[PDB]
Design an enzyme around this catalytic site. Sequence first.
Site, PDB file in Angstrom:
ATOM      1  N   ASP A  45       0.799  -1.216   0.000  1.00  0.00           N
ATOM      2  CA  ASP A  45       0.000   0.000   0.000  1.00  0.00           C
ATOM      3  C   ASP A  45       0.834   1.270   0.000  1.00  0.00           C
ATOM      4  O   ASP A  45       1.501   1.590   0.966  1.00  0.00           O
ATOM      5  CB  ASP A  45      -0.931   0.019   1.194  1.00  0.00           C
ATOM      6  CG  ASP A  45      -1.922   1.156   1.115  1.00  0.00           C
ATOM      7  OD1 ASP A  45      -2.905   1.035   0.321  1.00  0.00           O
ATOM      8  OD2 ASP A  45      -1.715   2.161   1.847  1.00  0.00           O
ATOM      9  N   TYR A  50       2.861   9.815  -0.347  1.00  0.00           N
ATOM     10  CA  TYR A  50       3.931   9.268   0.481  1.00  0.00           C
ATOM     11  C   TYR A  50       5.311   9.541  -0.116  1.00  0.00           C
ATOM     12  O   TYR A  50       6.326   9.254   0.522  1.00  0.00           O
ATOM     13  CB  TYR A  50       3.736   7.765   0.719  1.00  0.00           C
ATOM     14  CG  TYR A  50       2.383   7.387   1.307  1.00  0.00           C
ATOM     15  CD1 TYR A  50       1.635   8.296   2.024  1.00  0.00           C
ATOM     16  CD2 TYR A  50       1.868   6.114   1.167  1.00  0.00           C
ATOM     17  CE1 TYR A  50       0.409   7.960   2.542  1.00  0.00           C
ATOM     18  CE2 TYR A  50       0.632   5.775   1.701  1.00  0.00           C
ATOM     19  CZ  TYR A  50      -0.089   6.718   2.388  1.00  0.00           C
ATOM     20  OH  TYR A  50      -1.321   6.478   2.942  1.00  0.00           O
ATOM     21  N   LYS A  79      -2.912   5.935  -4.559  1.00  0.00           N
ATOM     22  CA  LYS A  79      -4.030   6.807  -4.219  1.00  0.00           C
ATOM     23  C   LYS A  79      -3.954   8.219  -4.880  1.00  0.00           C
ATOM     24  O   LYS A  79      -2.916   8.877  -4.923  1.00  0.00           O
ATOM     25  CB  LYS A  79      -4.182   6.895  -2.687  1.00  0.00           C
ATOM     26  CG  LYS A  79      -4.101   5.562  -1.912  1.00  0.00           C
ATOM     27  CD  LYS A  79      -4.476   5.783  -0.443  1.00  0.00           C
ATOM     28  CE  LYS A  79      -4.132   4.594   0.450  1.00  0.00           C
ATOM     29  NZ  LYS A  79      -2.678   4.512   0.799  1.00  0.00           N
ATOM     30  N   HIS A 112      -7.855   9.045  -2.246  1.00  0.00           N
ATOM     31  CA  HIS A 112      -7.140   9.127  -0.981  1.00  0.00           C
ATOM     32  C   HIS A 112      -7.951   9.797   0.121  1.00  0.00           C
ATOM     33  O   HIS A 112      -8.063   9.266   1.218  1.00  0.00           O
ATOM     34  CB  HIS A 112      -5.836   9.902  -1.191  1.00  0.00           C
ATOM     35  CG  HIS A 112      -4.810   9.659  -0.138  1.00  0.00           C
ATOM     36  ND1 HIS A 112      -3.462   9.837  -0.367  1.00  0.00           N
ATOM     37  CD2 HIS A 112      -4.916   9.209   1.135  1.00  0.00           C
ATOM     38  CE1 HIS A 112      -2.785   9.512   0.719  1.00  0.00           C
ATOM     39  NE2 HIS A 112      -3.645   9.119   1.640  1.00  0.00           N
TER      40      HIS A 112
HETATM   41  N1  LIG Z   1      -5.751   7.771   4.552  1.00  0.00           N
HETATM   42  C1  LIG Z   1      -5.111   6.637   4.349  1.00  0.00           C
HETATM   43  O1  LIG Z   1      -5.470   5.918   3.427  1.00  0.00           O
HETATM   44  C2  LIG Z   1      -4.027   6.179   5.294  1.00  0.00           C
HETATM   45  C3  LIG Z   1      -3.782   6.780   6.541  1.00  0.00           C
HETATM   46  C4  LIG Z   1      -2.791   6.239   7.353  1.00  0.00           C
HETATM   47  C5  LIG Z   1      -2.037   5.135   6.956  1.00  0.00           C
HETATM   48  N2  LIG Z   1      -2.272   4.601   5.759  1.00  0.00           N
HETATM   49  C6  LIG Z   1      -1.544   3.418   5.294  1.00  0.00           C
HETATM   50  O2  LIG Z   1      -1.433   2.506   6.384  1.00  0.00           O
HETATM   51  C7  LIG Z   1      -0.080   2.143   6.500  1.00  0.00           C
HETATM   52  C8  LIG Z   1       0.245   1.821   7.945  1.00  0.00           C
HETATM   53  O3  LIG Z   1      -0.355   2.743   8.857  1.00  0.00           O
HETATM   54  P1  LIG Z   1       0.536   3.531   9.948  1.00  0.00           P
HETATM   55  O4  LIG Z   1       1.954   3.462   9.479  1.00  0.00           O
HETATM   56  O5  LIG Z   1      -0.096   4.863  10.291  1.00  0.00           O
HETATM   57  O6  LIG Z   1       0.427   2.706  11.334  1.00  0.00           O
HETATM   58  P2  LIG Z   1       0.635   1.156  11.701  1.00  0.00           P
HETATM   59  O7  LIG Z   1       1.177   0.355  10.543  1.00  0.00           O
HETATM   60  O8  LIG Z   1      -0.574   0.712  12.456  1.00  0.00           O
HETATM   61  O9  LIG Z   1       1.672   1.264  12.924  1.00  0.00           O
HETATM   62  C9  LIG Z   1       2.984   0.947  12.585  1.00  0.00           C
HETATM   63  C10 LIG Z   1       3.910   1.276  13.708  1.00  0.00           C
HETATM   64  O10 LIG Z   1       4.020   0.083  14.479  1.00  0.00           O
HETATM   65  C11 LIG Z   1       5.346  -0.436  14.408  1.00  0.00           C
HETATM   66  N3  LIG Z   1       5.282  -1.901  14.275  1.00  0.00           N
HETATM   67  C12 LIG Z   1       5.107  -2.623  13.144  1.00  0.00           C
HETATM   68  N4  LIG Z   1       5.107  -3.952  13.405  1.00  0.00           N
HETATM   69  C13 LIG Z   1       5.273  -4.072  14.733  1.00  0.00           C
HETATM   70  C14 LIG Z   1       5.355  -5.187  15.659  1.00  0.00           C
HETATM   71  N5  LIG Z   1       5.257  -6.426  15.190  1.00  0.00           N
HETATM   72  N6  LIG Z   1       5.556  -4.927  16.965  1.00  0.00           N
HETATM   73  C15 LIG Z   1       5.666  -3.652  17.424  1.00  0.00           C
HETATM   74  N7  LIG Z   1       5.590  -2.583  16.627  1.00  0.00           N
HETATM   75  C16 LIG Z   1       5.389  -2.730  15.307  1.00  0.00           C
HETATM   76  C17 LIG Z   1       6.022   0.266  13.245  1.00  0.00           C
HETATM   77  O11 LIG Z   1       7.379   0.443  13.568  1.00  0.00           O
HETATM   78  P3  LIG Z   1       8.588  -0.151  12.726  1.00  0.00           P
HETATM   79  O12 LIG Z   1       8.424   0.300  11.289  1.00  0.00           O
HETATM   80  O13 LIG Z   1       9.661   0.531  13.519  1.00  0.00           O
HETATM   81  O14 LIG Z   1       8.574  -1.633  12.958  1.00  0.00           O
HETATM   82  C18 LIG Z   1       5.305   1.593  13.180  1.00  0.00           C
HETATM   83  O15 LIG Z   1       5.926   2.523  14.055  1.00  0.00           O
HETATM   84  C19 LIG Z   1       0.701   3.322   5.938  1.00  0.00           C
HETATM   85  O16 LIG Z   1       2.023   2.989   5.497  1.00  0.00           O
HETATM   86  C20 LIG Z   1      -0.156   3.677   4.767  1.00  0.00           C
HETATM   87  O17 LIG Z   1       0.158   2.722   3.739  1.00  0.00           O
HETATM   88  C21 LIG Z   1      -3.252   5.075   4.962  1.00  0.00           C
HETATM   89  C1  LIG Z   2       2.381  19.410   3.793  1.00  0.00           C
HETATM   90  O1  LIG Z   2       3.058  18.140   3.751  1.00  0.00           O
HETATM   91  C2  LIG Z   2       3.995  17.923   2.772  1.00  0.00           C
HETATM   92  C3  LIG Z   2       4.644  18.944   2.083  1.00  0.00           C
HETATM   93  C4  LIG Z   2       5.669  18.651   1.201  1.00  0.00           C
HETATM   94  C5  LIG Z   2       6.031  17.339   1.006  1.00  0.00           C
HETATM   95 CL1  LIG Z   2       7.353  16.976  -0.064  1.00  0.00          CL
HETATM   96  C6  LIG Z   2       5.389  16.304   1.651  1.00  0.00           C
HETATM   97  C7  LIG Z   2       4.349  16.577   2.544  1.00  0.00           C
HETATM   98  C8  LIG Z   2       3.703  15.350   3.119  1.00  0.00           C
HETATM   99  O2  LIG Z   2       3.940  14.239   2.637  1.00  0.00           O
HETATM  100  N1  LIG Z   2       2.865  15.506   4.149  1.00  0.00           N
HETATM  101  C9  LIG Z   2       1.958  14.444   4.584  1.00  0.00           C
HETATM  102  C10 LIG Z   2       2.596  13.550   5.573  1.00  0.00           C
HETATM  103  C11 LIG Z   2       1.833  12.273   5.846  1.00  0.00           C
HETATM  104  C12 LIG Z   2       1.829  11.230   4.929  1.00  0.00           C
HETATM  105  C13 LIG Z   2       1.279  10.000   5.246  1.00  0.00           C
HETATM  106  C14 LIG Z   2       0.666   9.827   6.477  1.00  0.00           C
HETATM  107  S1  LIG Z   2      -0.218   8.341   6.816  1.00  0.00           S
HETATM  108  O3  LIG Z   2      -1.149   8.627   7.865  1.00  0.00           O
HETATM  109  O4  LIG Z   2       0.734   7.286   6.970  1.00  0.00           O
HETATM  110  N2  LIG Z   2      -1.065   7.998   5.453  1.00  0.00           N
HETATM  111  C15 LIG Z   2      -2.032   8.857   4.939  1.00  0.00           C
HETATM  112  O5  LIG Z   2      -2.461   8.708   3.808  1.00  0.00           O
HETATM  113  N3  LIG Z   2      -2.343   9.909   5.757  1.00  0.00           N
HETATM  114  C16 LIG Z   2      -3.268  11.020   5.512  1.00  0.00           C
HETATM  115  C17 LIG Z   2      -4.560  10.641   4.799  1.00  0.00           C
HETATM  116  C18 LIG Z   2      -5.118  11.809   3.975  1.00  0.00           C
HETATM  117  C19 LIG Z   2      -4.921  13.145   4.660  1.00  0.00           C
HETATM  118  C20 LIG Z   2      -3.448  13.433   4.926  1.00  0.00           C
HETATM  119  C21 LIG Z   2      -2.593  12.175   4.824  1.00  0.00           C
HETATM  120  C22 LIG Z   2       0.654  10.854   7.406  1.00  0.00           C
HETATM  121  C23 LIG Z   2       1.233  12.067   7.083  1.00  0.00           C
END
Ligand SMILES: NC(=O)c1ccc[n+]([C@@H]2O[C@H](COP(=O)([O-])OP(=O)(O)OC[C@H]3O[C@@H](n4cnc5c(N)ncnc54)[C@H](OP(=O)(O)O)[C@@H]3O)[C@@H](O)[C@H]2O)c1
Ligand SMILES: COc1ccc(Cl)cc1C(=O)NCCc1ccc(S(=O)(=O)NC(=O)NC2CCCCC2)cc1
EC number: 1.1.1.-
Length: 318
Positions: A45, A50, A79, A112
């Site tokens: 994902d 990102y 996204k 997104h």
């Molecule tokens: N609007 C959206 O669509 C949206 C919003 C937020 C996120 N996302 C997606 O969701 C993905 C993941 O969400 P997220 O990164 O916010 O949170 P998350 O994956 O729930 O939390 C990950 C955190 O937990 C740690 N971790 C992972 N495996 C672990 C384990 N087995 N034991 C202990 N800790 C562990 C990771 O650290 P380490 O890396 O240090 O292991 C990281 O700091 C993002 O990369 C993105 O693709 C999408």
């Molecule tokens: C204003 O900022 C920027 C300005 C310049 C550049 Cl060069 C990059 C950024 C930037 O990248 N800033 C967002 C940083 C960011 C990305 C991923 C995540 S997340 O939560 O892991 N995944 C999500 O999609 N998060 C949300 C969902 C939709 C609303 C906003 C993002 C959380 C936070």
Amino acid sequence: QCVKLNDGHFMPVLGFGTYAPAEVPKSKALEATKLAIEAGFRHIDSAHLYNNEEQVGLAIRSKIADGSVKREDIFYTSKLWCNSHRPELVRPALERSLKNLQLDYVDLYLIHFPVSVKPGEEVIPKDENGKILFDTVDLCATWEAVEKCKDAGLAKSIGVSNFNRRQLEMILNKPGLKYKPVCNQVECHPYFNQRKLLDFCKSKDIVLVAYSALGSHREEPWVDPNSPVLLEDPVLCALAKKHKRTPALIALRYQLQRGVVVLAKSYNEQRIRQNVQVFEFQLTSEEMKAIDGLNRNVRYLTLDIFAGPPNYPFSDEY
Ligand SMILES: NC(=O)c1ccc[n+]([C@@H]2O[C@H](COP(=O)([O-])OP(=O)(O)OC[C@H]3O[C@@H](n4cnc5c(N)ncnc54)[C@H](OP(=O)(O)O)[C@@H]3O)[C@@H](O)[C@H]2O)c1
Ligand SMILES: COc1ccc(Cl)cc1C(=O)NCCc1ccc(S(=O)(=O)NC(=O)NC2CCCCC2)cc1
């Protein structure tokens, strides 16, 4: 490892989170994703936002060249960011993500976030007074250009992220609708279990995709650092001892058992390997209901900066 999507395609139930805050070198995006593919993740994902589709794409392309996978075996998500919600700009954004990826198609393309921002090269354009330069785009229009991306075969499947119920209804009720959202990717974990939203999604054959399933990155200013730390939860820890697993595994496994497709981000090789062990144990009904009792309605990703316009999705109950 898969769930059938409403467009007939299959989505693996465990996906790899590729976002890491920019303090972490993007070189790790590449290393981590290869390790995830190697450890057995088949669903990856990302997003334009990102700023890693070069690295993640190389990662994927790298694991195909060494014979570890074929492209058919990988489910990649991108996204559509909020500054390309205008229909005319939807195709070019997907194409830009692909040129960066060096891939011909994405398996899944999401809206997104439902709030549109002003077109331009700025990610989140604001004025000098205070606020985000919001744009007026009809989401139902945006969706139609997303459907055209399915027709062109740039995206194998299409869906949404961070849509509330009325917004999902809105798309479902749209005259002329070609394709349903395959999914709604939202925050979901035991402190915000999304029960109502999850039920609505199942009542309409929409896959709910849990993000921040391990409790979020906790990156400021996106997350209140006073928020409780999901993986320190006493019950998640108890269940982990009882199953000889970790609180992460408990939390991931919870989602699989309630029909939720679950993301986990990790850039740590150990924890990457650990996370695939969600497919090696299971929870009792009594345990699963214990975890239902952990519901706090603590939303880590409030996305307050986007509040104001009608399409800000978390004003509604769900
Ligand atoms: N609007 C959206 O669509 C949206 C919003 C937020 C996120 N996302 C997606 O969701 C993905 C993941 O969400 P997220 O990164 O916010 O949170 P998350 O994956 O729930 O939390 C990950 C955190 O937990 C740690 N971790 C992972 N495996 C672990 C384990 N087995 N034991 C202990 N800790 C562990 C990771 O650290 P380490 O890396 O240090 O292991 C990281 O700091 C993002 O990369 C993105 O693709 C999408
Ligand atoms: C204003 O900022 C920027 C300005 C310049 C550049 Cl060069 C990059 C950024 C930037 O990248 N800033 C967002 C940083 C960011 C990305 C991923 C995540 S997340 O939560 O892991 N995944 C999500 O999609 N998060 C949300 C969902 C939709 C609303 C906003 C993002 C959380 C936070």
